[PDB]
Amino acid sequence: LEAKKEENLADWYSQVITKSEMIEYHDISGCYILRPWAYAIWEAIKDFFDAEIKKLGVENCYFPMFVSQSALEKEKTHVADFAPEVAWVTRSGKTELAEPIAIRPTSETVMYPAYAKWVQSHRDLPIKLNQWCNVVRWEFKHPQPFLRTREFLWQEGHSAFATMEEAAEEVLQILDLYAQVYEELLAIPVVKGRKTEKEKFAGGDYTTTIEAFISASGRAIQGGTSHHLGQNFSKMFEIVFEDPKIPGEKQFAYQNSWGLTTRTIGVMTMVHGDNMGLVLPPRVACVQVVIIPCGILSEEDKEALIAKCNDYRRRLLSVNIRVRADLRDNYSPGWKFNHWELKGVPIRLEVGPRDMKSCQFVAVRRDTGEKLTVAENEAETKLQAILEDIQVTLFTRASEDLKTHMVVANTMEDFQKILDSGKIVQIPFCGEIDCEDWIKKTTARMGAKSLCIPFKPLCELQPGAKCVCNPAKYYTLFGRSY
Amino acid sequence: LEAKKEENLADWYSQVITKSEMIEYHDISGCYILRPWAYAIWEAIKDFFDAEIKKLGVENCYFPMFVSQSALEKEKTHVADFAPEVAWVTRSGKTELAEPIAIRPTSETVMYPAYAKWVQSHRDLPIKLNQWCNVVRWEFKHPQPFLRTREFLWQEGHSAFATMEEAAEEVLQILDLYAQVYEELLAIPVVKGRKTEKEKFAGGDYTTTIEAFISASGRAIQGGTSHHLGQNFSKMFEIVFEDPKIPGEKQFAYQNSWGLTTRTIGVMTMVHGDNMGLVLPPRVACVQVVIIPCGILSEEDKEALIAKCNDYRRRLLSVNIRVRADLRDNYSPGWKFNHWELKGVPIRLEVGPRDMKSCQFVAVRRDTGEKLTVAENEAETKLQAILEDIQVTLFTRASEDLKTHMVVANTMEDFQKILDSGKIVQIPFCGEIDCEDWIKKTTAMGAKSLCIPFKPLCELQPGAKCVCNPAKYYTLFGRSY
Ligand SMILES: O=C(NC1Cc2ccccc2C1)c1nccnc1NC(=O)C1CCCCC1
Ligand SMILES: O=C(NC1Cc2ccccc2C1)c1nccnc1NC(=O)C1CCCCC1
Ligand code: PRO
Ligand code: PRO
Ligand SMILES: [Zn+2]
Ligand SMILES: [Zn+2]
């Protein structure tokens, strides 16, 4: 790895993702191969998220990837927003299909006619379904692996309710889980918030979101979303039920949908990645500790060196640490050091003959570079500590970054200045589509746009305060965006 | 449930898949919704299969759904066989794409240019990759949920090796795991075989397979496949390495591919289903035991009855049995019986006021129907024991069916007779492409070759003739899905 993060980011990213063996390029643009090293991160995100939504009563399922023209261009607004970026299938082999079929950009239009069939009374609710699948949004903006791709893996949850109370409860429950994924697993702090009128999910009542900041970009990125759809969809798809306690009055279901994707891995790369390459937080790292023999003159002494590598491995397995021992003899110690640094392994455990004699090993923390000489009988205690402290450090540094590039401005002039150093700004705002488009026009002379309206904003808004422009309604976090 | 398995099978199947809440229909022909109850079975297969391939050094990954037209055509025998069931994306919104992009029917031509890029020497071998994903084969043939669909979920494993010895070892390892899924997980007997020339995977050298028999229709079905691709693909995609032994000579990689699908769930339905609905082999059942409070009266006794089911629950969880206590006051005991029988749960645990006070319960086995009054002391014993007997029973039952519907026919005339009683026959067969086409024409609806069984029923005697050409091998032939 030659390229440096501080100067050229695009070249750095492309080198980091390929040399870590996370990503290979495909001949179709906007499409990327997720290799084992990347896919394992997603698998850890899944193991956690799945277990958590199961407690909330959600069940896993699989719906078809194809939507009919009828199901789609039946209902407006939602379909109106996605329409341009929907990939259409128009032939099998040489045979033109009589009716074009669409690839899923999201599964509302696929799921809800099935929900309408399954809802026939109050006791068929709630319906709480999730799926792990691929989705396609065939946009032409500059793609980047993980962050911005045409095909991507996600989960999508869709729940339908008798009462608004249960639905509103679920939206926030889910949004906290998405925040838990970013802060606990990936050591990325997030701003919980609400989307503006312009940015909200097309058909829905409201949209909650977690935002994260990428230092080197000077840009922010939506990292997860939880919608309340209200009854907008239940009315369009006739998901209705009678309740004999409200005679005759048809009750349209209350709905949420929620989504999280492999963008999660890209954000991780952007935040914690350095000039040595990938940096894995221990909690998602599929290899937490890599054991490497050094000094490798007798056959018996090399055998014993290998054995001490295996002892360290088994001990680490016993305190629930994910450990590989690179005992391959085709490559030098120095080659392996660089190989596993690039891949982002939290801890490299060096074992040489002189250190065996001394009853020590070297633990090399990937975040700090910290060469630490550790006593042999403390491996478990100290590795754990370093591991959990690597997590805490990565979170601390990224938090410190966040409350450094997230600041408050009250006027258009002071918004403009702060913004062009690579920062994100909470400004007083009136929430108008017109007022938001104008901001984008002016702020570009790479235009800036809104991110979220935070649940815990930095300041309270003054009684009678004018929007950075009609009076304001809330502080709205704005910025340059992915 | 309205239809009877033996009078109208399709209607029966349609009723069992929907009434058990396994399948919903979609508005596109050939595409089906896998609801929770079906998808849980796939997840049990996945848990089993993933752990097994990880021991073999295989890793999970995700390659794109889309193939460029150049990549897809690179291996010519492969492309031609698949080209007419390939779905092509030609636009996004109104915005036409510069170049029509194809949806994967299998990932060979997606993955292998990446494999060429990754192999720079023999130290980069082996590559062993697997993915769980959906694929699309847009066939106009008559569709059937699980068994025969346009889009389905599967795993596809793709490995590349330096030597042919390494690759042939894996082909059979994977097939043995496929056999374990059917036999150990689904309590379905299978026959391990090799495909014929007409039926082998188009790009490859040889295809190993598993066949399962479905009594009710008299038809066999391909359960999964494991192909040795040889060097046919590595030559086309340039997956090459050198050896410092003979400097300057390129060796092409030896390749395998292997797939298994959600067809598994349909085969299980077809084999073990009855006129009371689905029957679940406990080994893949997400709910092994359902506890239903019966005979529902004073609230203290009514709640002590609820209290008894929860003890039965907790004591069952404790010996790692998958249990549900259906303690909803919304639905009558009778409704609960029917609903969990339709979903095919292995044991119904009936707790009624009278039997609770007499320190017992009823356990109702789903497979045979029988009801056992069982003392409360022997719960975790008799219930673990019962789950284990149901697993064997279903296997034995389907095994005895196979041992009775697979037989030997040594002439073409008596091949016809045995075949028309809804049987599958092992014949002496020459192996040739047209003699295989001829077996289909004359038997119509036609009967096709399923596999050449690793271990046929009998020994092909000194210079035996075929059904046509002398007999090269005994071959399992039948009416087919
Ligand atoms: O949006 C994405 N791509 C579109 C934007 C873009 C840019 C350039 C070329 C193509 C495209 C398509 C995307 N790509 C990868 C991972 N994740 C994504 N979205 C999310 O994470 C969102 C948050 C959660 C719910 C779903 C959206
Ligand atoms: O073959 C299948 N579909 C095609 C045939 C057909 C029939 C009617 C309408 C559409 C189509 C498309 C299919 N469908 C569902 C599940 N599994 C399948 N194949 C397998 O299990 C085989 C064994 C494993 C490897 C892949 C093939
Ligand atoms: O596309 C979206 O954003 C919503 C959330 C997941 C499912 N659909
Ligand atoms: O389609 C097939 O039969 C092979 C096996 C899985 C990948 N390709
Ligand atoms: Zn304004
Ligand atoms: Zn013949």
Short mmCIF file of N, CA, C and O in Angstrom, two decimals, chain A residues 24 26-28 31-36 39 43 59-69 71 83-84 86-93 97 100-101 103-104 110 114 117-118 123 129 134 136 138 140 151 153 324 330-331, chain B residues 24 26-28 31-36 39 43 59-68 71 83-84 86-93 95 97 100-101 103-104 110 114 117-118 123 129 134 136 138 140 151 153 330-331:
data_model
loop_
_atom_site.label_atom_id
_atom_site.label_comp_id
_atom_site.label_asym_id
_atom_site.label_seq_id
_atom_site.Cartn_x
_atom_site.Cartn_y
_atom_site.Cartn_z
N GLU A 24 -13.35 -7.43 -4.99
CA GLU A 24 -12.89 -7.51 -6.36
C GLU A 24 -13.86 -6.75 -7.24
O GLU A 24 -15.06 -6.68 -6.94
N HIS A 26 -15.94 -6.04 -10.81
CA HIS A 26 -16.72 -6.77 -11.81
C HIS A 26 -16.74 -5.92 -13.08
O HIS A 26 -16.53 -4.70 -13.01
N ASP A 27 -16.99 -6.54 -14.23
CA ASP A 27 -17.03 -5.81 -15.50
C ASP A 27 -18.25 -4.87 -15.66
O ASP A 27 -18.15 -3.87 -16.37
N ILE A 28 -19.37 -5.21 -15.00
CA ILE A 28 -20.51 -4.28 -14.85
C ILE A 28 -20.18 -3.23 -13.77
O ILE A 28 -19.88 -3.58 -12.63
N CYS A 31 -21.19 -2.61 -9.54
CA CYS A 31 -21.31 -3.96 -8.99
C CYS A 31 -19.95 -4.46 -8.54
O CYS A 31 -18.96 -4.34 -9.26
N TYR A 32 -19.92 -5.01 -7.33
CA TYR A 32 -18.67 -5.44 -6.72
C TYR A 32 -18.81 -6.81 -6.09
O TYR A 32 -19.88 -7.18 -5.62
N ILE A 33 -17.71 -7.54 -6.10
CA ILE A 33 -17.61 -8.86 -5.50
C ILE A 33 -17.26 -8.67 -4.03
O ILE A 33 -16.28 -8.01 -3.70
N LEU A 34 -18.08 -9.25 -3.14
CA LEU A 34 -17.73 -9.32 -1.73
C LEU A 34 -16.99 -10.63 -1.45
O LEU A 34 -17.58 -11.72 -1.49
N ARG A 35 -15.70 -10.51 -1.18
CA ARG A 35 -14.84 -11.66 -0.92
C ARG A 35 -15.01 -12.11 0.54
O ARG A 35 -15.62 -11.38 1.32
N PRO A 36 -14.51 -13.32 0.91
CA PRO A 36 -14.64 -13.84 2.29
C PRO A 36 -14.31 -12.84 3.39
O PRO A 36 -15.09 -12.68 4.32
N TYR A 39 -17.28 -10.50 3.53
CA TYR A 39 -18.57 -11.15 3.75
C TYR A 39 -18.66 -11.55 5.25
O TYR A 39 -19.72 -11.47 5.85
N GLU A 43 -21.68 -11.03 7.94
CA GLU A 43 -22.13 -12.19 8.73
C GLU A 43 -22.20 -11.92 10.24
O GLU A 43 -23.11 -12.44 10.91
N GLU A 59 -39.94 -12.40 12.22
CA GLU A 59 -39.56 -13.67 11.60
C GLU A 59 -38.97 -13.53 10.21
O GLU A 59 -39.33 -12.64 9.44
N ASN A 60 -38.03 -14.41 9.90
CA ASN A 60 -37.32 -14.35 8.63
C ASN A 60 -38.12 -15.02 7.52
O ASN A 60 -38.81 -16.03 7.76
N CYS A 61 -38.04 -14.47 6.31
CA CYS A 61 -38.78 -15.03 5.17
C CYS A 61 -38.06 -14.67 3.88
O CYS A 61 -37.00 -14.04 3.93
N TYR A 62 -38.61 -15.08 2.72
CA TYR A 62 -38.04 -14.69 1.42
C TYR A 62 -39.14 -14.46 0.39
O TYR A 62 -39.91 -15.38 0.07
N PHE A 63 -39.21 -13.24 -0.13
CA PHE A 63 -40.20 -12.88 -1.16
C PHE A 63 -39.47 -12.78 -2.50
O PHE A 63 -38.28 -12.46 -2.52
N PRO A 64 -40.17 -13.05 -3.63
CA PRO A 64 -39.57 -12.93 -4.96
C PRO A 64 -38.92 -11.56 -5.24
O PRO A 64 -39.35 -10.52 -4.73
N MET A 65 -37.92 -11.59 -6.10
CA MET A 65 -37.14 -10.42 -6.52
C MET A 65 -37.84 -9.65 -7.67
O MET A 65 -37.44 -8.52 -8.01
N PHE A 66 -38.87 -10.26 -8.24
CA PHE A 66 -39.57 -9.67 -9.34
C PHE A 66 -40.90 -9.05 -8.97
O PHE A 66 -41.70 -9.66 -8.27
N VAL A 67 -41.13 -7.82 -9.46
CA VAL A 67 -42.42 -7.11 -9.32
C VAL A 67 -43.10 -7.00 -10.68
O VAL A 67 -42.43 -6.72 -11.68
N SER A 68 -44.42 -7.21 -10.69
CA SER A 68 -45.22 -7.09 -11.91
C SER A 68 -45.45 -5.62 -12.25
O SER A 68 -45.50 -4.78 -11.33
N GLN A 69 -45.58 -5.30 -13.55
CA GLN A 69 -45.92 -3.93 -13.94
C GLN A 69 -47.20 -3.48 -13.23
O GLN A 69 -47.23 -2.40 -12.65
N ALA A 71 -48.58 -4.56 -10.22
CA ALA A 71 -48.39 -4.25 -8.79
C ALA A 71 -47.70 -2.89 -8.58
O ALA A 71 -48.04 -2.13 -7.66
N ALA A 83 -39.15 4.72 -9.63
CA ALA A 83 -39.30 4.41 -11.06
C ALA A 83 -38.05 4.55 -11.93
O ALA A 83 -37.74 3.59 -12.62
N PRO A 84 -37.34 5.74 -11.90
CA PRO A 84 -36.12 5.94 -12.72
C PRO A 84 -34.99 4.95 -12.52
O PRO A 84 -34.32 4.61 -13.48
N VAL A 86 -35.27 1.72 -11.36
CA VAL A 86 -35.78 0.33 -11.41
C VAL A 86 -35.32 -0.37 -12.70
O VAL A 86 -35.65 0.07 -13.82
N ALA A 87 -34.55 -1.45 -12.51
CA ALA A 87 -34.05 -2.31 -13.56
C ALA A 87 -35.16 -3.21 -14.06
O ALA A 87 -35.75 -3.96 -13.29
N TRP A 88 -35.44 -3.13 -15.35
CA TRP A 88 -36.50 -3.92 -15.94
C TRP A 88 -35.93 -5.06 -16.77
O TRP A 88 -34.98 -4.86 -17.53
N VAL A 89 -36.56 -6.23 -16.64
CA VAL A 89 -36.26 -7.46 -17.40
C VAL A 89 -37.24 -7.55 -18.55
O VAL A 89 -38.46 -7.54 -18.33
N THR A 90 -36.75 -7.64 -19.79
CA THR A 90 -37.68 -7.56 -20.92
C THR A 90 -37.64 -8.73 -21.90
O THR A 90 -38.40 -8.73 -22.89
N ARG A 91 -36.78 -9.71 -21.62
CA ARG A 91 -36.67 -10.94 -22.45
C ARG A 91 -35.97 -12.08 -21.75
O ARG A 91 -35.08 -11.84 -20.95
N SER A 92 -36.40 -13.31 -22.05
CA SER A 92 -35.64 -14.51 -21.74
C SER A 92 -35.04 -15.07 -23.04
O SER A 92 -35.76 -15.34 -24.03
N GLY A 93 -33.72 -15.22 -23.01
CA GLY A 93 -32.95 -15.64 -24.15
C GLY A 93 -33.27 -14.68 -25.26
O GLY A 93 -33.12 -13.46 -25.09
N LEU A 97 -40.39 -11.02 -23.51
CA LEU A 97 -41.51 -11.28 -22.63
C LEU A 97 -42.69 -10.43 -23.08
O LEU A 97 -42.51 -9.30 -23.54
N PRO A 100 -43.10 -6.88 -19.39
CA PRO A 100 -41.85 -6.59 -18.66
C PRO A 100 -41.98 -6.74 -17.12
O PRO A 100 -42.97 -6.33 -16.53
N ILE A 101 -40.98 -7.34 -16.49
CA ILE A 101 -40.98 -7.58 -15.06
C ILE A 101 -39.79 -6.84 -14.43
O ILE A 101 -38.71 -6.78 -15.00
N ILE A 103 -37.02 -5.65 -11.36
CA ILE A 103 -36.27 -6.13 -10.24
C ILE A 103 -36.54 -5.19 -9.05
O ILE A 103 -36.53 -3.96 -9.18
N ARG A 104 -36.90 -5.81 -7.94
CA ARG A 104 -36.95 -5.21 -6.62
C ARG A 104 -35.92 -4.06 -6.42
O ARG A 104 -34.71 -4.30 -6.53
N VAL A 110 -43.93 -5.76 -3.55
CA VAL A 110 -43.94 -7.23 -3.57
C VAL A 110 -44.70 -7.82 -2.35
O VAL A 110 -45.42 -8.83 -2.50
N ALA A 114 -49.47 -9.53 -0.49
CA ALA A 114 -49.52 -10.76 0.33
C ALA A 114 -50.05 -10.44 1.72
O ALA A 114 -50.88 -11.18 2.23
N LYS A 117 -53.77 -10.24 1.75
CA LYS A 117 -54.38 -11.57 1.77
C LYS A 117 -54.40 -12.20 3.16
O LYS A 117 -55.31 -12.94 3.47
N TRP A 118 -53.39 -11.91 3.99
CA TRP A 118 -53.23 -12.60 5.26
C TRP A 118 -53.96 -11.91 6.40
O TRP A 118 -54.12 -12.49 7.47
N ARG A 123 -56.84 -10.48 14.87
CA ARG A 123 -55.92 -11.52 15.38
C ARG A 123 -54.86 -12.01 14.36
O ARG A 123 -53.96 -12.77 14.73
N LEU A 129 -42.26 -9.21 9.50
CA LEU A 129 -41.43 -10.02 8.60
C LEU A 129 -40.13 -9.32 8.23
O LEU A 129 -40.08 -8.09 8.10
N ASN A 134 -30.79 -9.36 -1.72
CA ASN A 134 -30.17 -8.38 -2.64
C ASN A 134 -31.24 -7.47 -3.25
O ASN A 134 -32.40 -7.83 -3.45
N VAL A 136 -31.74 -3.86 -6.01
CA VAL A 136 -31.13 -3.19 -7.15
C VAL A 136 -31.73 -1.82 -7.40
O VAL A 136 -32.94 -1.68 -7.63
N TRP A 138 -30.69 1.01 -9.96
CA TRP A 138 -29.81 1.17 -11.09
C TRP A 138 -29.59 2.67 -11.48
O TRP A 138 -29.83 3.10 -12.61
N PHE A 140 -27.07 6.17 -11.78
CA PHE A 140 -25.87 6.48 -12.62
C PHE A 140 -24.91 7.48 -11.95
O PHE A 140 -24.00 7.99 -12.60
N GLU A 151 -26.13 -2.98 -7.06
CA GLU A 151 -26.64 -4.14 -6.37
C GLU A 151 -26.03 -4.11 -4.98
O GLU A 151 -24.83 -3.82 -4.82
N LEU A 153 -26.49 -5.93 -0.74
CA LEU A 153 -27.16 -6.79 0.25
C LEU A 153 -27.69 -5.90 1.37
O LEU A 153 -27.11 -4.87 1.72
N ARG A 324 -6.25 -16.95 14.22
CA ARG A 324 -5.62 -17.77 13.20
C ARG A 324 -4.15 -17.77 13.52
O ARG A 324 -3.62 -16.83 14.13
N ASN A 330 5.85 -20.94 3.23
CA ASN A 330 6.20 -20.40 1.90
C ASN A 330 6.55 -18.90 1.92
O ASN A 330 7.15 -18.40 0.97
N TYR A 331 6.14 -18.19 2.98
CA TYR A 331 6.31 -16.72 3.09
C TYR A 331 7.10 -16.34 4.33
O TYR A 331 7.03 -17.05 5.35
N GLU B 24 -47.03 -18.64 -0.16
CA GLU B 24 -48.03 -17.75 -0.77
C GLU B 24 -47.75 -17.59 -2.28
O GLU B 24 -46.59 -17.61 -2.70
N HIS B 26 -47.63 -15.49 -5.90
CA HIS B 26 -47.24 -14.15 -6.35
C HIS B 26 -47.95 -13.91 -7.67
O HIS B 26 -48.44 -14.86 -8.27
N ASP B 27 -47.99 -12.68 -8.15
CA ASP B 27 -48.67 -12.42 -9.40
C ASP B 27 -47.82 -12.72 -10.65
O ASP B 27 -48.31 -12.60 -11.76
N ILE B 28 -46.55 -13.11 -10.48
CA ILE B 28 -45.74 -13.53 -11.60
C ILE B 28 -45.70 -15.04 -11.55
O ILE B 28 -45.27 -15.61 -10.55
N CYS B 31 -43.02 -17.78 -9.58
CA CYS B 31 -42.36 -17.18 -8.42
C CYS B 31 -43.25 -17.33 -7.21
O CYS B 31 -44.42 -17.12 -7.31
N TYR B 32 -42.67 -17.69 -6.07
CA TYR B 32 -43.43 -18.04 -4.85
C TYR B 32 -42.84 -17.36 -3.63
O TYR B 32 -41.66 -17.04 -3.60
N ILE B 33 -43.68 -17.08 -2.63
CA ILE B 33 -43.25 -16.45 -1.41
C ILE B 33 -42.94 -17.58 -0.44
O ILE B 33 -43.79 -18.44 -0.23
N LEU B 34 -41.73 -17.61 0.10
CA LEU B 34 -41.37 -18.47 1.23
C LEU B 34 -41.66 -17.72 2.54
O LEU B 34 -40.95 -16.73 2.92
N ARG B 35 -42.71 -18.18 3.21
CA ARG B 35 -43.14 -17.62 4.46
C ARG B 35 -42.26 -18.24 5.57
O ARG B 35 -41.64 -19.27 5.33
N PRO B 36 -42.22 -17.62 6.77
CA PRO B 36 -41.52 -18.13 7.98
C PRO B 36 -41.45 -19.62 8.11
O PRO B 36 -40.34 -20.13 8.25
N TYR B 39 -39.26 -21.10 5.31
CA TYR B 39 -37.92 -20.53 5.41
C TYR B 39 -37.12 -21.06 6.63
O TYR B 39 -35.88 -21.18 6.55
N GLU B 43 -33.36 -22.59 6.67
CA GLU B 43 -32.37 -22.20 7.70
C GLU B 43 -31.74 -23.36 8.50
O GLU B 43 -30.52 -23.31 8.76
N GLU B 59 -15.16 -21.16 2.04
CA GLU B 59 -15.58 -19.88 2.63
C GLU B 59 -16.75 -19.25 1.89
O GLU B 59 -16.86 -19.44 0.69
N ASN B 60 -17.61 -18.52 2.63
CA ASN B 60 -18.73 -17.78 2.05
C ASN B 60 -18.35 -16.41 1.45
O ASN B 60 -17.40 -15.76 1.87
N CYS B 61 -19.11 -16.01 0.45
CA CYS B 61 -18.83 -14.76 -0.29
C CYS B 61 -20.10 -14.38 -1.02
O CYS B 61 -21.10 -15.10 -0.94
N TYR B 62 -20.08 -13.23 -1.70
CA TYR B 62 -21.21 -12.87 -2.53
C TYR B 62 -20.75 -12.21 -3.82
O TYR B 62 -20.14 -11.16 -3.81
N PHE B 63 -21.01 -12.88 -4.94
CA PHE B 63 -20.71 -12.40 -6.31
C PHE B 63 -21.96 -11.80 -6.87
O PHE B 63 -23.04 -12.22 -6.48
N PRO B 64 -21.85 -10.80 -7.77
CA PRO B 64 -23.02 -10.11 -8.32
C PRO B 64 -24.04 -10.99 -9.04
O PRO B 64 -23.73 -12.06 -9.54
N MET B 65 -25.27 -10.51 -9.10
CA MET B 65 -26.33 -11.15 -9.87
C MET B 65 -26.20 -10.99 -11.40
O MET B 65 -26.86 -11.73 -12.16
N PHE B 66 -25.39 -10.04 -11.84
CA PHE B 66 -25.40 -9.65 -13.24
C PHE B 66 -24.18 -10.11 -14.02
O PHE B 66 -23.04 -10.02 -13.54
N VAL B 67 -24.45 -10.60 -15.24
CA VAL B 67 -23.41 -11.02 -16.15
C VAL B 67 -23.45 -10.19 -17.43
O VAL B 67 -24.50 -10.01 -18.04
N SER B 68 -22.29 -9.70 -17.85
CA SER B 68 -22.13 -9.15 -19.20
C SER B 68 -22.22 -10.24 -20.26
O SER B 68 -21.90 -11.40 -20.00
N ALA B 71 -18.76 -12.20 -20.98
CA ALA B 71 -18.41 -13.20 -19.97
C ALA B 71 -19.25 -14.49 -20.07
O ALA B 71 -18.71 -15.59 -19.96
N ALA B 83 -28.63 -20.40 -22.44
CA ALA B 83 -28.98 -19.13 -23.08
C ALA B 83 -30.49 -18.83 -23.20
O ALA B 83 -30.87 -17.68 -22.97
N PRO B 84 -31.34 -19.86 -23.52
CA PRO B 84 -32.78 -19.55 -23.65
C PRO B 84 -33.57 -19.38 -22.34
O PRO B 84 -34.67 -18.85 -22.37
N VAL B 86 -32.14 -17.65 -19.81
CA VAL B 86 -31.52 -16.45 -19.23
C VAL B 86 -32.43 -15.21 -19.35
O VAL B 86 -32.84 -14.83 -20.46
N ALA B 87 -32.73 -14.59 -18.20
CA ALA B 87 -33.39 -13.28 -18.17
C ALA B 87 -32.39 -12.12 -18.39
O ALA B 87 -31.29 -12.09 -17.79
N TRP B 88 -32.77 -11.20 -19.28
CA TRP B 88 -31.96 -10.03 -19.62
C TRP B 88 -32.61 -8.72 -19.17
O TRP B 88 -33.74 -8.42 -19.55
N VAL B 89 -31.87 -7.95 -18.38
CA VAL B 89 -32.24 -6.56 -18.06
C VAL B 89 -31.80 -5.68 -19.22
O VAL B 89 -30.63 -5.71 -19.58
N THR B 90 -32.73 -4.89 -19.77
CA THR B 90 -32.41 -4.00 -20.91
C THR B 90 -32.66 -2.50 -20.65
O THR B 90 -32.28 -1.65 -21.48
N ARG B 91 -33.30 -2.19 -19.52
CA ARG B 91 -33.57 -0.79 -19.13
C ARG B 91 -33.69 -0.54 -17.63
O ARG B 91 -34.01 -1.45 -16.86
N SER B 92 -33.39 0.70 -17.23
CA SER B 92 -33.74 1.20 -15.91
C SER B 92 -34.65 2.42 -16.00
O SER B 92 -34.22 3.51 -16.42
N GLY B 93 -35.90 2.23 -15.60
CA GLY B 93 -36.92 3.22 -15.82
C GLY B 93 -37.14 3.26 -17.32
O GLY B 93 -37.21 2.20 -17.96
N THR B 95 -34.85 4.88 -19.04
CA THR B 95 -33.42 4.99 -19.43
C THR B 95 -32.87 3.62 -19.81
O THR B 95 -32.60 2.77 -18.94
N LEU B 97 -30.16 0.92 -20.96
CA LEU B 97 -28.76 0.64 -20.68
C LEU B 97 -28.00 0.54 -21.99
O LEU B 97 -28.56 0.09 -22.99
N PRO B 100 -27.26 -4.61 -22.77
CA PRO B 100 -28.17 -5.56 -22.08
C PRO B 100 -27.45 -6.51 -21.14
O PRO B 100 -26.56 -7.25 -21.56
N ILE B 101 -27.88 -6.51 -19.90
CA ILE B 101 -27.22 -7.16 -18.82
C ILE B 101 -28.05 -8.38 -18.35
O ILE B 101 -29.28 -8.29 -18.20
N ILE B 103 -29.28 -11.73 -15.92
CA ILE B 103 -29.41 -12.26 -14.55
C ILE B 103 -28.83 -13.69 -14.47
O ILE B 103 -29.21 -14.52 -15.28
N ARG B 104 -27.92 -13.94 -13.52
CA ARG B 104 -27.34 -15.28 -13.27
C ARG B 104 -28.34 -16.45 -13.16
O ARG B 104 -29.28 -16.38 -12.37
N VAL B 110 -19.82 -15.63 -13.86
CA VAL B 110 -19.61 -14.47 -12.97
C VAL B 110 -18.29 -14.60 -12.19
O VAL B 110 -17.55 -13.64 -12.04
N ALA B 114 -12.84 -13.66 -12.01
CA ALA B 114 -12.21 -13.26 -10.76
C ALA B 114 -11.19 -14.33 -10.32
O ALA B 114 -10.04 -13.98 -9.94
N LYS B 117 -7.97 -13.93 -12.11
CA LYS B 117 -7.30 -12.78 -11.54
C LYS B 117 -6.62 -13.20 -10.24
O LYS B 117 -5.53 -12.72 -9.93
N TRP B 118 -7.23 -14.12 -9.49
CA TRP B 118 -6.66 -14.44 -8.19
C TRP B 118 -5.56 -15.47 -8.25
O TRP B 118 -4.74 -15.50 -7.35
N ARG B 123 0.49 -21.53 -5.27
CA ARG B 123 0.26 -21.24 -3.86
C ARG B 123 -1.06 -20.52 -3.60
O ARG B 123 -1.52 -20.48 -2.48
N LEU B 129 -14.98 -21.50 -2.63
CA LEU B 129 -15.92 -20.45 -2.30
C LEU B 129 -17.32 -20.97 -2.41
O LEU B 129 -17.63 -21.83 -3.25
N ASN B 134 -29.97 -16.22 -4.73
CA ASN B 134 -31.10 -16.61 -5.54
C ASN B 134 -30.59 -16.64 -6.94
O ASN B 134 -29.68 -15.88 -7.26
N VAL B 136 -32.04 -17.41 -11.28
CA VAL B 136 -33.21 -17.30 -12.15
C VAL B 136 -33.08 -18.16 -13.39
O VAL B 136 -32.19 -17.96 -14.23
N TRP B 138 -35.58 -18.87 -16.36
CA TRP B 138 -36.89 -18.43 -16.82
C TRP B 138 -37.50 -19.40 -17.85
O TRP B 138 -37.66 -19.05 -19.03
N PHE B 140 -40.39 -21.82 -19.53
CA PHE B 140 -41.83 -21.71 -19.79
C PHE B 140 -42.62 -22.97 -19.44
O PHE B 140 -43.84 -22.93 -19.41
N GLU B 151 -37.40 -18.55 -10.10
CA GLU B 151 -36.39 -18.06 -9.18
C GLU B 151 -36.36 -18.99 -7.96
O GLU B 151 -37.38 -19.34 -7.40
N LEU B 153 -33.92 -20.03 -4.24
CA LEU B 153 -32.76 -19.96 -3.36
C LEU B 153 -31.95 -21.24 -3.46
O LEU B 153 -32.50 -22.36 -3.64
N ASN B 330 -57.28 -16.72 22.55
CA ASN B 330 -57.97 -16.35 21.30
C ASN B 330 -58.60 -17.52 20.55
O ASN B 330 -59.68 -17.36 19.96
N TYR B 331 -57.91 -18.67 20.53
CA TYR B 331 -58.28 -19.82 19.69
C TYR B 331 -58.61 -21.02 20.55
O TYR B 331 -57.92 -21.29 21.54
#
